[PDB]
Amino acid sequence: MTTITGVVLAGGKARRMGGVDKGLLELNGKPLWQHVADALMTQLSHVVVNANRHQEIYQASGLKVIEDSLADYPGPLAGMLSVMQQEAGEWFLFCPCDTPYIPPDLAARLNHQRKDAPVVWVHDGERDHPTIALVNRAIEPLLLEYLQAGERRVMVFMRLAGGHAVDFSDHKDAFVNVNTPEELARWQ
Template sequence: MKIVSSPHPVAITGVILAGGRGSRMGGEDKGLILWQNTPLYQHVLQRLQPQVTTVWINANRNIEVYQQSGVPVIKDTLADFPGPLAGMLAALQQAETEWVVFTSCDTPCLPDNLVQHLWQQKNEALAVWARTEERDHPTLALLHRSLADSLQSYLARGDRKLMLFLTQAGGHSVLFMQSAEKFRNFNCPEDLL
């Protein structure tokens, strides 16, 4: 495990969420799609790694390819690709750190102060997520691992709405001013141009 000096006083696990179906990308594994000749998840890894104690990748296919990055790969504990909350649950259940920060695999320009700003603005909340002036970015979130049980119950009821879970957990958004370009994500092939 690589320990780095960080701007927050506690160990934080970073998790890149790459476990989705990639439906809007024609079923391709979004994290492995090339942008600027590098897989999207590699861009995210390079930006996230200096901000956290350790990084994991949550993936449900192409595990061997993701393992080539040298970081641990964890799979969803629930079947049938139930969405980002399933990846979050798997990480919260396995994390050794109290706090886990999540990023999507298709947000290659992440700000270098993502974790620091979420940490500084969380106050007493057990969940916070990024927001720009334009919209919320709930897959870019900092969660306390104590939320694992309530998240498991939420998913067991068939609920899948990420924002609803985060707000029910008492969470709030954290505004990143003039940062829309940093949070740009790639949902369909046209976004890669």
């Protein structure tokens, strides 16, 4: 009953009993993934999280937690496909769990600049953020075919799908990410 479902991408694999769970690291006492979820809920009514480790912890703030399919496809695209297979609704706005400062006009500006494309993603002036992406339903079959072919590359897929970057270079530092605990300590 809403147009775009927000999705926090909180990683997968744990391809050695995980290691740090980045989405659960705390920034000012609140888990990084919840900073992203709260920023998505400012702009969207329906927000879910894709998480494959510590699921009961991710379930604690009351959002639906979606796990990756048993296919165990690689990379961020696997979480996108698993969410589209488990959620109805024509559009998704994905965002990784490590970009806590995303702006309240993310969905609006991606939608305004979509210009007929089935997928658009953020460019911050210096680099593409292809996992911060507004994606139409019609991508689901193409994504399934690409991952079943053994591919993983995100930007290559977003280009194959006919997407384009949307310029958010005027949003100073809204797209900074926390790569490690060492980086997180400098943002407290």
